[PDB]
Protein backbone atom coordinates (compact mmCIF):
# COMPACT_ATOMS: atom_id res chain seq x y z
CA UNK A 1 0.00 0.00 0.00
CA UNK A 2 1.13 3.55 -0.70
CA UNK A 3 1.66 4.85 2.88
CA UNK A 4 3.18 7.82 4.70
CA UNK A 5 4.18 6.37 8.11
CA UNK A 6 6.35 4.88 9.40
CA UNK A 7 7.78 4.62 5.86
CA UNK A 8 7.01 6.84 2.86
CA UNK A 9 6.30 4.43 -0.02
CA UNK A 10 4.43 6.42 -2.66
CA UNK A 11 6.08 5.71 -6.04
CA UNK A 12 4.34 8.06 -8.50
CA UNK A 13 6.26 11.04 -9.84
CA UNK A 14 4.29 14.13 -10.96
Amino acid sequence: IXRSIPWYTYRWLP
Partner: antibody
Amino acid sequence: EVQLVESGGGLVKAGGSLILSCGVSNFRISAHTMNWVRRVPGGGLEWVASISTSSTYRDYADAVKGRFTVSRDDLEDFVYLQMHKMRVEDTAIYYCARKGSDRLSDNDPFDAWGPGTVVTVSP
Amino acid sequence: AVVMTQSPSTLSASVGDTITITCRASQSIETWLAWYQQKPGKAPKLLIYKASTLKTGVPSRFSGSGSGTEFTLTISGLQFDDFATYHCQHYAGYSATFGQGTRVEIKR
Protein backbone atom coordinates in the same frame (compact mmCIF):
# COMPACT_ATOMS: atom_id res chain seq x y z
CA GLU B 1 -14.14 35.76 2.16
CA VAL B 2 -12.35 32.40 2.00
CA GLN B 3 -11.15 31.38 5.44
CA LEU B 4 -9.12 28.57 7.05
CA VAL B 5 -8.72 27.72 10.76
CA GLU B 6 -6.21 25.40 12.45
CA SER B 7 -6.98 23.47 15.60
CA GLY B 8 -4.89 21.42 17.88
CA GLY B 9 -1.59 23.11 18.69
CA GLY B 10 0.28 23.14 22.00
CA LEU B 11 3.20 21.90 24.06
CA VAL B 12 4.70 18.49 23.34
CA LYS B 13 7.61 16.55 24.84
CA ALA B 14 10.24 15.21 22.48
CA GLY B 15 9.26 11.80 21.16
CA GLY B 16 5.61 12.69 21.68
CA SER B 17 2.69 12.83 19.26
CA LEU B 18 0.32 15.64 18.23
CA ILE B 19 -2.44 15.83 15.68
CA LEU B 20 -3.64 19.04 14.01
CA SER B 21 -6.83 19.68 12.07
CA CYS B 22 -7.84 22.34 9.59
CA GLY B 23 -11.37 23.55 8.85
CA VAL B 24 -12.62 26.02 6.24
CA SER B 25 -15.34 28.56 5.45
CA ASN B 26 -16.92 29.67 2.15
CA PHE B 27 -15.43 27.00 -0.10
CA ARG B 28 -15.23 23.22 -0.45
CA ILE B 29 -11.78 21.61 -0.23
CA SER B 30 -12.59 18.77 -2.67
CA ALA B 31 -11.18 20.49 -5.77
CA HIS B 32 -8.08 21.81 -3.96
CA THR B 33 -4.72 20.26 -3.18
CA MET B 34 -4.29 21.08 0.52
CA ASN B 35 -1.04 21.84 2.28
CA TRP B 36 0.72 22.23 5.61
CA VAL B 37 3.42 24.86 6.04
CA ARG B 38 5.34 25.96 9.13
CA ARG B 39 7.23 29.08 10.17
CA VAL B 40 10.27 28.21 12.24
CA PRO B 41 11.59 30.53 15.00
CA GLY B 42 14.23 31.93 12.65
CA GLY B 43 11.40 33.42 10.60
CA GLY B 44 11.60 31.32 7.43
CA LEU B 45 8.77 29.24 5.97
CA GLU B 46 9.04 25.49 5.47
CA TRP B 47 6.76 23.38 3.29
CA VAL B 48 5.70 20.35 5.37
CA ALA B 49 3.17 18.28 3.46
CA SER B 50 0.76 18.19 0.55
CA ILE B 51 -2.26 16.02 -0.21
CA SER B 52 -3.76 15.95 -3.68
CA THR B 53 -7.41 15.87 -4.68
CA SER B 54 -8.98 12.44 -4.02
CA SER B 55 -6.10 11.82 -1.54
CA THR B 56 -4.38 10.21 -4.48
CA TYR B 57 -0.88 11.60 -3.88
CA ARG B 58 0.80 12.63 -0.63
CA ASP B 59 4.24 14.27 -0.40
CA TYR B 60 6.31 15.38 2.59
CA ALA B 61 9.38 17.45 3.38
CA ASP B 62 12.35 15.12 3.83
CA ALA B 63 12.75 16.41 7.38
CA VAL B 64 9.37 14.92 8.36
CA LYS B 65 9.11 11.98 5.95
CA GLY B 66 8.23 8.81 7.87
CA ARG B 67 6.99 10.73 10.93
CA PHE B 68 4.12 12.85 9.59
CA THR B 69 0.88 11.97 7.83
CA VAL B 70 -1.55 14.28 6.10
CA SER B 71 -5.21 13.31 5.57
CA ARG B 72 -8.31 14.97 4.13
CA ASP B 73 -12.08 14.75 4.69
CA ASP B 74 -13.81 16.07 1.58
CA LEU B 75 -17.38 15.50 2.79
CA GLU B 76 -17.03 17.75 5.88
CA ASP B 77 -14.03 19.73 4.60
CA PHE B 78 -11.23 18.94 7.05
CA VAL B 79 -7.49 18.40 6.70
CA TYR B 80 -5.36 16.60 9.28
CA LEU B 81 -1.69 16.47 10.14
CA GLN B 82 -0.40 13.65 12.31
CA MET B 83 2.95 14.38 13.91
CA HIS B 84 4.85 11.52 15.54
CA LYS B 85 8.31 10.98 17.02
CA MET B 86 8.55 14.75 17.43
CA ARG B 87 11.81 16.66 17.57
CA VAL B 88 12.69 20.07 19.00
CA GLU B 89 13.17 21.45 15.49
CA ASP B 90 9.50 20.66 14.77
CA THR B 91 8.83 23.71 16.94
CA ALA B 92 7.00 26.24 14.77
CA ILE B 93 3.77 27.93 13.79
CA TYR B 94 1.79 25.57 11.57
CA TYR B 95 -0.46 26.90 8.83
CA CYS B 96 -3.05 25.11 6.77
CA ALA B 97 -2.91 26.36 3.15
CA ARG B 98 -4.94 25.93 0.00
CA LYS B 99 -3.46 25.48 -3.45
CA GLY B 100 -5.72 27.50 -5.72
CA SER B 101 -6.67 30.38 -7.98
CA ASP B 102 -9.64 32.13 -9.62
CA ARG B 103 -9.61 29.28 -12.13
CA LEU B 104 -7.79 26.05 -11.17
CA SER B 105 -4.78 24.80 -13.20
CA ASP B 106 -2.23 21.99 -12.95
CA ASN B 107 -0.05 24.24 -10.76
CA ASP B 108 -1.33 27.14 -8.64
CA PRO B 109 0.22 29.02 -5.69
CA PHE B 110 -1.03 28.99 -2.10
CA ASP B 111 -3.80 31.58 -2.35
CA ALA B 112 -5.39 31.15 1.09
CA TRP B 113 -3.87 30.43 4.49
CA GLY B 114 -5.10 29.80 8.02
CA PRO B 115 -3.92 32.14 10.81
CA GLY B 116 -1.53 29.49 12.15
CA THR B 117 -1.31 27.40 15.32
CA VAL B 118 1.72 27.26 17.62
CA VAL B 119 3.44 23.92 18.18
CA THR B 120 6.29 23.80 20.69
CA VAL B 121 8.43 20.76 21.29
CA SER B 122 10.32 20.86 24.60
CA PRO B 123 13.78 19.24 24.77
CA ALA C 1 15.62 18.60 -4.60
CA VAL C 2 15.24 22.21 -5.73
CA VAL C 3 17.00 24.56 -3.31
CA MET C 4 15.64 28.14 -3.17
CA THR C 5 18.13 30.82 -2.07
CA GLN C 6 16.83 34.28 -1.16
CA SER C 7 19.01 37.41 -0.84
CA PRO C 8 19.55 39.49 1.23
CA SER C 9 18.42 38.12 4.59
CA THR C 10 17.66 41.62 5.82
CA LEU C 11 17.09 44.69 3.69
CA SER C 12 17.19 48.06 5.43
CA ALA C 13 15.61 50.93 3.55
CA SER C 14 13.55 54.11 3.86
CA VAL C 15 10.05 55.18 2.92
CA GLY C 16 10.12 56.27 -0.72
CA ASP C 17 12.95 53.94 -1.75
CA THR C 18 12.92 51.43 -4.58
CA ILE C 19 14.18 48.04 -3.36
CA THR C 20 14.93 44.65 -4.93
CA ILE C 21 14.79 41.22 -3.30
CA THR C 22 16.48 38.34 -5.07
CA CYS C 23 15.48 34.69 -5.23
CA ARG C 24 17.65 32.05 -6.88
CA ALA C 25 16.75 28.46 -7.80
CA SER C 26 19.32 25.64 -7.78
CA GLN C 27 17.94 24.62 -11.15
CA SER C 28 15.53 26.03 -13.73
CA ILE C 29 11.94 26.29 -12.49
CA GLU C 30 10.73 28.33 -15.48
CA THR C 31 8.31 30.90 -13.99
CA TRP C 32 6.79 28.69 -11.26
CA LEU C 33 7.68 31.16 -8.51
CA ALA C 34 5.51 33.03 -6.01
CA TRP C 35 6.14 35.87 -3.56
CA TYR C 36 4.43 36.16 -0.19
CA GLN C 37 4.30 38.91 2.41
CA GLN C 38 4.07 38.08 6.11
CA LYS C 39 3.80 40.38 9.08
CA PRO C 40 4.71 39.26 12.65
CA GLY C 41 2.17 36.84 14.12
CA LYS C 42 0.07 36.97 10.94
CA ALA C 43 -0.52 34.54 8.06
CA PRO C 44 1.48 34.78 4.82
CA LYS C 45 -0.23 36.80 2.09
CA LEU C 46 0.22 35.96 -1.61
CA LEU C 47 1.44 38.93 -3.67
CA ILE C 48 2.78 37.61 -6.95
CA TYR C 49 2.63 34.27 -8.77
CA LYS C 50 3.84 32.91 -12.09
CA ALA C 51 6.88 35.12 -11.34
CA SER C 52 5.25 38.40 -12.45
CA THR C 53 1.45 38.28 -12.04
CA LEU C 54 0.00 40.39 -9.22
CA LYS C 55 -2.87 39.08 -7.15
CA THR C 56 -6.02 41.19 -7.05
CA GLY C 57 -5.72 43.90 -4.41
CA VAL C 58 -1.94 44.16 -4.60
CA PRO C 59 -0.70 47.73 -5.21
CA SER C 60 1.18 48.44 -8.45
CA ARG C 61 4.35 49.46 -6.58
CA PHE C 62 4.93 45.71 -6.25
CA SER C 63 6.37 43.98 -9.30
CA GLY C 64 8.09 40.72 -10.12
CA SER C 65 10.30 39.45 -12.92
CA GLY C 66 12.63 36.62 -13.83
CA SER C 67 12.59 33.11 -15.19
CA GLY C 68 14.75 30.00 -14.98
CA THR C 69 17.03 30.39 -11.95
CA GLU C 70 17.12 34.14 -11.14
CA PHE C 71 14.06 36.02 -9.88
CA THR C 72 13.41 39.52 -8.55
CA LEU C 73 10.75 41.18 -6.41
CA THR C 74 10.78 44.97 -6.77
CA ILE C 75 8.99 47.50 -4.60
CA SER C 76 8.99 50.98 -6.13
CA GLY C 77 8.28 53.59 -3.47
CA LEU C 78 8.41 51.82 -0.13
CA GLN C 79 5.51 52.71 2.20
CA PHE C 80 5.26 51.99 5.97
CA ASP C 81 2.83 49.15 5.26
CA ASP C 82 5.53 47.38 3.24
CA PHE C 83 7.95 46.73 6.09
CA ALA C 84 7.58 43.02 6.62
CA THR C 85 9.13 39.69 5.74
CA TYR C 86 8.98 38.50 2.13
CA HIS C 87 9.16 34.82 1.17
CA CYS C 88 9.81 33.43 -2.31
CA GLN C 89 8.46 30.02 -3.25
CA HIS C 90 8.90 27.46 -5.98
CA TYR C 91 5.55 25.69 -6.31
CA ALA C 92 5.04 22.36 -8.11
CA GLY C 93 1.83 20.30 -8.37
CA TYR C 94 2.35 18.40 -5.11
CA SER C 95 5.30 20.05 -3.40
CA ALA C 96 6.98 23.38 -2.79
CA THR C 97 10.15 24.92 -1.42
CA PHE C 98 10.66 28.33 0.20
CA GLY C 99 13.59 30.70 0.44
CA GLN C 100 14.88 31.62 3.91
CA GLY C 101 12.84 34.82 3.77
CA THR C 102 13.81 38.50 3.57
CA ARG C 103 12.98 40.96 6.31
CA VAL C 104 12.51 44.53 5.13
CA GLU C 105 13.08 47.07 7.90
CA ILE C 106 13.52 50.80 8.40
CA LYS C 107 17.15 51.89 8.03
CA ARG C 108 18.85 53.93 10.75
